[PDB]
Design a protein around this nucleic acid. Structure first.
Ligand SMILES: [Mg+2]
Ligand SMILES: [Mg+2]
Ligand SMILES: [Mg+2]
Ligand SMILES: [Mg+2]
Lengths: 261, 37, 242, 261, 45, 48, 45, 28
DNA sequence: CGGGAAAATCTCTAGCA
DNA sequence: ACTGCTAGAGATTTTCCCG
DNA sequence: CGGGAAAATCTCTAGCA
DNA sequence: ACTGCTAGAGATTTTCCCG
């Protein structure tokens, strides 16, 4: 292929032909043509085809403003449940945002808030509010709304319901509260056939109850598993398996080659 | 649900035990199925 | 399935509610509810109190969840039926409100508030609120320095009340109590949905007379007849819609 | 359910709750709640989740203008092959478009052109050009670029290649012709591992040759199939099957219950 | 119910037939007709 | 401000428990202890 | 603590938490927690 | 490349740390 | 019949409007 | 009566080549 | 074990940014 | 060091109910 490699490179600096073109024309193994393309800086123009996944921890909220009929609507969503909070604010200011976030934190457990990099969420007043209530702030990558896919999807859902009930109310703020009500309690679906209100209550109660249950379980139950190794702490056992926490690492081991002390 | 830790949750999905990061798991009781049986 | 007699004797001895009879004897909540609903000798999550306090020439509209002590509050610009109906619409969109108690003020008796309660399915009705106003005002006093404006002080005080003040029997905050209460209420309503559904049926086991349907499992069909609970195989019984 | 139907409707005129919400709240069979939603005019807000398919007949071209560095590029694509024709035109006028289309029709067989509803493609001069060359015009649904998905995808491909070779040429028209060359002959892929030039030649030659082959076959071969019916004309037979054209309807019948005359 | 279904129910009260008309002529789903005949004391099936 | 009202609330709880216990006793001196054992162990709730 | 005094102090500075709560939340002996309260001008033990 | 998560990377482009979603990056 | 690597097929995205 | 597609990046499965 | 209908699960899209 | 999602419409498969 020594002859063809030099020619395909010259043709690539003119044409930037993809690897199949070089492999067909200059009789090349697919790996060599691919290497020619790969080392071209002008031919690197496409990302990888995948999507990430947002954090859906029980304490994470996603926030964003949305605009409707010239007014600013500050919308928050609890990621795990789909529950929502929303108000019309007078302006997209850091002060209005600090106030909204303080109200949210005083009504619901809020461990982390995830927003874009708009001026209102990045402001020092919002920081001071988040420091006071103990809220971690996660800032999305700039110009990447998929980072806040949940609240963007929920802003669509809320705009649709506001459109549905707009002529039942004079002012926009009231339509926003009617739509919030409707979404939280008058729309069922999702993981447990729930409405979002039912679902957030279940998520938060489940968090509380499982925390308590397993804390008591670990207080009373005390063992040490040796597998394969060191004194691994026991997490669970059953059906020919054991769960252990060895140096902050959780691994599923079969019952064989595993002895409990 | 088998075990719930801070950063991970241990589950069993059809006789197949898996460790799932906490941020990838939603844990509910599901009250309808419960009241039903 | 073989605890129905055990649960019956346990209830005849101790009059225990259906939740214990189901968590202990492994019986569907409907069967335990029937065991508890078939004896004569053995015979709130949606109610909010609304009021408007005054602090530093400003109106604080306060809403207490009676069963839990959970508070929602907000500096409102004017004690008017408009801002009150707005506060109430917000409240009802965030929590499952079924009943509010107010003190026959004017903001509470207007047509706007009654229209909002009508839209949201809230029934209006005309001592814990005073005590909770006192506690709210006291926290406001402790944190009024920590804020420039009084609306921020109000929201900080609400936060502190709901989540930072552990108390009561189990030592919970009002946030955890309202969550536990509402979840129990979701259980109450889904159990009622199940019972309401299957009460429109009639069974026929072994053919014997029409018998109330209680469960319809994968390997059996639990029923009731002559105040007696019998478990028969699915093939041996016939369930018809009446 | 007679009680619950009246209540769910009253709640729906306020809340517009979806069908699961009504079925859970008012104890309803899923079909009844769905009927409540279905007869609400305010709740019809979503299309069906599918995509159509564009016509890929051997004679169809899709046309569209695209804009780059302030100039207008008139791009055409042969749908079946991915081959492309493109020129910089001075303005998006009906005259420039008639000229482009006449050149295209004099170089390649063009039976139908598919465009959007822009002023230049709808003009009477383009109509007169299409009437002279025997070209059917298909107009896409307005505000629906997916109708011309192929040429929109090809405009992206052509803009990317122009970007790759921009600094090899002074003027934009020359970069456009370099990119046309590159796409047609220096990029391989698609159905037959082809470049688009190779592929259009194969498509058009295959059309010619199969037309001739099957015409001769039908001239010499002459039969009449009776199945199940009338005197169906025979198309093909083999492997326990027969293909027939009975009243302009093609159906595949097994060999049994089918007799050839 | 729909005006057609209410008319079918009134026609039942007039004519003491439930399934033979609304399930066929009025295109009512079979579940609703079964529920109606269950509620109908005049429909012993 | 937790005990202040809960004391009367759980007084009402015990009155209610006696309201069902009394059918199995002719004298209060035993029914009271019956209710006390019920409320001490056979009613499980609260946090978990 | 493990600098729990520091953490409890700031928690109190914002929410003026009671000593039982701080003793429990930051694993501080009651005497230390009650001192945080005693040091604050906004409270009483 | 400095760090690679799921969904995003951190990159050093001439002493200028950037965070890029993996949809918008290519790692050779 | 078995691996192991090389080739072919599959999943999925941006960007065009 | 008209209609999303294409090309690349990485993952997965299939096939081929020496045993 | 067999259909047939009713319910549950799957595929896929717009629209939000 | 961070990350697309959600809800509805229609298609497909599964389950349940009388035999
Ligand atoms: Mg934004
Ligand atoms: Mg937005
Ligand atoms: Mg166009
Ligand atoms: Mg265009």
């Amino acid at each position: 292929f020594l002859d063809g490699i030099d020619k395909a490179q010259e043709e690539h600096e003119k044409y930037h032909s993809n690897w199949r073109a070089m492999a067909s024309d200059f009789n090349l193994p697919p790996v060599v043509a691919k290497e020619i393309v790969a080392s071209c800086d002008k031919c690197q123009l496409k990302g990888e085809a995948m999507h990430g996944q947002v954090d859906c921890s029980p304490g994470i909220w996603q926030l964003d403003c949305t605009h409707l009929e010239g007014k600013v609507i500050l919308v928050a969503v609890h990621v795990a449940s789909g529950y929502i909070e929303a108000e019309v604010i007078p302006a997209e200011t850091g002060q209005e945002t600090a106030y909204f976030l303080l109200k949210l934190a005083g009504r619901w457990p809020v461990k982390t808030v995830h927003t874009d990099n708009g001026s209102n969420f990045t402001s020092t007043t919002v920081k001071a509010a988040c420091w006071w209530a103990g809220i971690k702030q996660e800032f999305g990558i700039p110009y990447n709304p998929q980072s806040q896919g949940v609240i963007e999807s929920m802003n669509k859902e809320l705009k649709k319901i506001i459109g549905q009930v707009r002529d039942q109310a004079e002012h926009l703020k009231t339509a926003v509260q009617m739509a919030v009500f409707i979404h939280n309690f008058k729309r069922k679906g999702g993981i447990g056939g729930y409405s979002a209100g039912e679902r957030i209550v279940d998520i938060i109660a489940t968090d509380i109850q499982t925390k308590e249950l397993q804390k008591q379980i670990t207080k009373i139950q005390n063992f040490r598993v040796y597998y394969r190794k060191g004194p691994a702490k026991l997490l669970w056992k059953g059906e020919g398996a054991v769960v252990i926490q060895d140096n902050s690492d959780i691994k599923v081991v079969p019952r064989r080659k595993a002895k409990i002390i | 649900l088998l075990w719930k830790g801070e950063g991970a949750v241990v589950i069993q999905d059809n006789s197949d035990i898996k460790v799932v990061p906490r941020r990838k798991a939603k844990i509910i009781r599901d009250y309808g199925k419960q009241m039903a049986g």
